[model samples]
Target: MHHRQEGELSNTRLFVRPFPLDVQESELNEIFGPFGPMKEVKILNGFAFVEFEEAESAAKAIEEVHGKSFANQPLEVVYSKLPAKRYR
Candidate 1:
């Protein structure tokens, strides 16, 4: 529902913060969509929630996307405090 996990390992949910305030879900998804099965990307006050159907997808996506630049700001992606267990 928070932070800190072995980034190289699998984590189904990720918290994406520390990016430009103007960024939106569209941009976020495009970045994450490639690795795929990203359940959704939700944002609040510029912070975003990224969920993946597969743990391996999350790990792979995080490895490539984390720390990548977003509107000139560095992206900070971390595993969620609690893994998003299920979705409807």
Candidate 2:
């Protein structure tokens, strides 16, 4: 893929993509762990969600983690358009 330019960005609940469903719980943890604390981390096929207690960590997460490598692929980190995801 070619390098893409970022537009504007925000929100405390971050959305992630390009997750490898064939993986472990601790994998994302280790990837995002250095950015500090968060409220939730949801992983599924080809996507993920991480919600922070505030905007600070989420902003930090996007700056570093967004477009950064994970599971041998880069991430698409952004804020949610709706609420935090709910598992049925």
All-Cα superposition RMSD per candidate: 4.6, 6.6
**20-61 per-residue lDDT for model 1 (tens digits):** 768788987888888878876778786778889888888788
**lDDT (0-100) at residue 55 of candidate 1?**
84
Candidate 2, 21: how far from true, in Å?
2.0
Number of clashing residue pairs in every model? 3, 0
Q: Which residue pairs does candidate 1 place in steric collision?
A: 1-81, 1-82, 2-81
Candidate 1 structure, TM-score to reference:
0.75
lDDT of 1 at 33: 88
**Residue-level lDDT for 35 in candidate 2:** 80
RMSD of 1: 4.6
Per-model TM values vs. the true structure: 0.75, 0.71
lDDT of each: 0.76, 0.71
Report the CA-based lDDT of candidate 1 relative to the real structure: 0.76
